[model samples]
Target: VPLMELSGRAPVVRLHDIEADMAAATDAIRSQLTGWGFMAAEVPGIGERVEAMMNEFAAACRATGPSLSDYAYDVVPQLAVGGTHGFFPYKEFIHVSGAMIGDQPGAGDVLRAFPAFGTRAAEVFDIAFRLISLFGEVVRGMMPPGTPELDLSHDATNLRVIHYRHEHSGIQMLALQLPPSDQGLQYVLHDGTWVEPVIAGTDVVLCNIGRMLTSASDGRFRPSTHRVHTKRLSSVLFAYPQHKARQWKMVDGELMSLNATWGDFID
Candidate 1:
């Protein structure tokens, strides 16, 4: 009952309202991100689409037997049995690069290999762009004047269709996750209490604040420390800044550079 009790505190935001009233939505989003570092985004039809896509992709992988190389999708194995620790040791995932989803060279090959996924991936990417833009709008008001803009126009972003067999944890800049089931995902609060977010339905997308946004906003926004605790399948889109995008943070009344290779941020 404790987890259920904590659900009452979970933040929920609707996309339709955000579109209709930017100012009200911005305030609501800002408060929730600052307080909880996570929110349930009600995106209407996205949950069903994402759940269907993930199930299909998982089934396709099972049928083809993890030899994703044929489709030009990278299958990453993270078990501790054979090698060094992976970021998420209990999961194996198909990593689809943003380039493969966007209008870039080699995109055609990937799209052709899995036409259904590619088509759905493009739709998801568009929604991601919209959400990121909304975050940018919110950040602009919080960040100091002359702060660099956030960009994801290049091949830096990626989507991972993951199959989790157990527990795993990590940090990221920002992520949009379509969790096929409701029980596994959890995040730590500022006081170090771990709580499961109340996902109203499979249609609700989970959005979590990440380290980059916290740093970019000079800690005005908090970064969520989260993990999975059960077996399930899910799709996550990590929205990363463009490779060449400049980044900075405010420190002691002066702007400080936080620029580094994109790999440094990937966890």
Candidate 2:
């Protein structure tokens, strides 16, 4: 009676195959993303648009690393974007976040640096490039159209698979993994009332999750709950130039401040 309503039921949404060029554009959520405590937040704007914002953020971090770090920042943290093809969730996950390395001021700055700091051409360009391939090339390959991702960060060889499994409302689980078929995590809504978000003859819909879900909805329309369950190794196309794997921890303060920006909010 749990997933029976949606799972066991016959075909409902139009399960169509998704693709961009000829590669798989979908990025699957793995089991690690949900570790400790994390949420599958839905992005408010479009994927590429958000990346545009990320470009600005990354630029600020790269240009003013000392200042950003002095004030505490993710300095371009590793990220993960996953989903599937054939009318599946488009850009199921767009995980962009910084990290915290240690208690000292910017002690663990190199927490998740891609291309190995000592590797050749280990500069910001490399980071940006790798990210483009992973998200744009790899993730975008599985998308049909309309859904888009911009790998603004070049040389960004950090192929991050957002893996996570967290305890949601208990009686239910927001699993983000793949079935034997390959398409990875999408959505999982479970309530005592069995209120469905979709109707028959619908596509995956590919929804968005943001502050509205956390505030306006009063915690109802949470973004997404996706996961990953697969191994990816393409002849080691590039090594992950990861930093110390830091977590830009925020404690009652803003990790970043605006000099001439609109809002200097702690929000």
Candidate 3:
């Protein structure tokens, strides 16, 4: 299950004695993101909000679309949150402007794959991904294109997302490292600059590409770029929104030029 562990890239952080408080976990992620130069903030009730929205689409009898956007995502709560680990490439554009900027869900690939997490995890993943897509769309709806700036060091960074988690979504995530760097990539953190502090317990890292700065840095800022690698064994899990429909816009972000919309390119 090594290569199968596609939930994230960063190594796991130790949380042996830590309690599983969703709010605390969420706040920790936000702090880690901030320290790493990422705009990390736990959207209160975001999961529940998205869950309701996705449920609507799932229950909608007419809720149908191309092979990629199919699957109403109307699974039971247990099955919905249980599904885990999947490659919904349908929304690859989510990382536009980078080497591999597009991800497609693929043919009949949604409801299947990653049996370890059960169909419920998969359903939750679909919902999360879709919700992200929709979020991007709505956010970018008001702003112009090519607004977010890129390639500017120290200030202007690329927009991206990096989400990491463990078996219990309650664990949320541990560390979000952002090292000062220029070019960025998925495996770039393996460099020598990373520090693997061997503490007393296990370490799990929560990784995800950050927005605005994610693109400005071309995946090199908070996520796809400069970051210290804790390199700890971790089980990363990502619960995406229903579909990649909610495209977001970088409004008032200095690095952003408001020229391109996450919908048009970011995916």
Candidate 4:
């Protein structure tokens, strides 16, 4: 007999509520993150603009040719060989780093290809930092007495816009992704049940916990395992610790020296 599908949904956290009542909002955010590793955030004044920008960017990429410069803003057919040699669905995306774009060599082509990309990238980056700060506060409350403070003040963040054409895959680390108009974004619960979270409003952004937080919190927080099961457009901001930030590992409830920088750790 086929087993019944067990499902669940992510809790919603309103940013305004956090501002109005820090203690209460923190409790809600902490509970949701610890339990589900994911939450839908209602961030005012930015969700609609970001979603529209993502859609417009998708349209621009479709109009472009096979691929662009190093950015590779095009829809290409990918193949996963080895166990099952077959083609994956066509995935289109472009990665934009707000802080480093100006210093990158071929960034001009990207700006030229997509005019509004730079401005929109800045907006996403700003929000990513804001969310990181919020999460940092939460982590501070969860850290052990002697654990070093979490510092992610670096420009290693990336804004990636993905146009998914009916595909599913997993990701790592903290990501703030704007949900598409379709129902495809799903997260795996601790017991392995998949659930599609409901966004209360069009201005809500989905935040997922990652391995870095899980490790930093010494397993107090869970890492969200998520995937897209259908066609949709997503703009995700991947936030990383600064390249120079020290990396620490929890050992027997104590933070031990990892003897590595964030850049080295990531590598």
* Per-residue error (Å), model 4, residue 60: 1.8
Question: Taking the tens digit of each residue's C-alpha lDDT, what string does model 4 give over 81-197?
Answer: 101111122476666654444533443355555667556756666766576556666656766677766665434566776666422322234667665556666777767777776
What are the TM-scores, per candidate, against the unseen true structure? 0.76, 0.22, 0.30, 0.75
- Name model 4 segments beyond 4 Å from true: 1-24, 64-70, 73-90, 101-109, 165-173
- True lDDT of residue 140, candidate 1: 60
lDDT of 4: 0.57
The sequence of per-residue lDDT tens digits that candidate 2 reaches over residues 1-267 is 122122322122211312231122232311112221211211122222223333333343344434333323233332232111010112221122122222123323433332132122122223323322332333223223432232222222221221121212211111111111123222344332222222122111122232211222234334344323332100001122122221121123223221421111111
Candidate number with the higher TM-score (1 or 2): 1
Write down the TM-score for model 4.
Answer: 0.75
Off by over 4 Å in 3: 1-20, 25-27, 37-192, 197-205, 211-213, 216-221, 224-259
Q: What's the count of clashing pairs in each model shown?
A: 0, 67, 102, 0
Candidates in order have lDDT scores of 0.58, 0.24, 0.27, 0.57
Write the number of the candidate with greater lDDT, choosing between 1 and 2. Answer: 1
Top model by lDDT, which number?
Answer: 1
Q: Which ranking of candidates, highest lDDT first?
A: 1, 4, 3, 2
Maximum-TM-score candidate: 1
Q: Is candidate 1 or candidate 3 better by TM-score?
A: 1
lDDT of 1 by residue, 1-267 (tens): 135233233234455564554455677666766676665555556666777667666655555532345544333322221111112222666656556555345444545566676677666666665665566566566667666666544355667777653223334457776655447677777677778765524555656666777776677767667776654677777777754445667665467776664445553
Supply the global lDDT for candidate 3: 0.27
Off by over 4 Å in 1: 4-23, 65-67, 72-90, 165-172, 257-267
RMSD of each: 5.8, 17.3, 15.0, 7.1
For model 2 the TM-score comes to 0.22
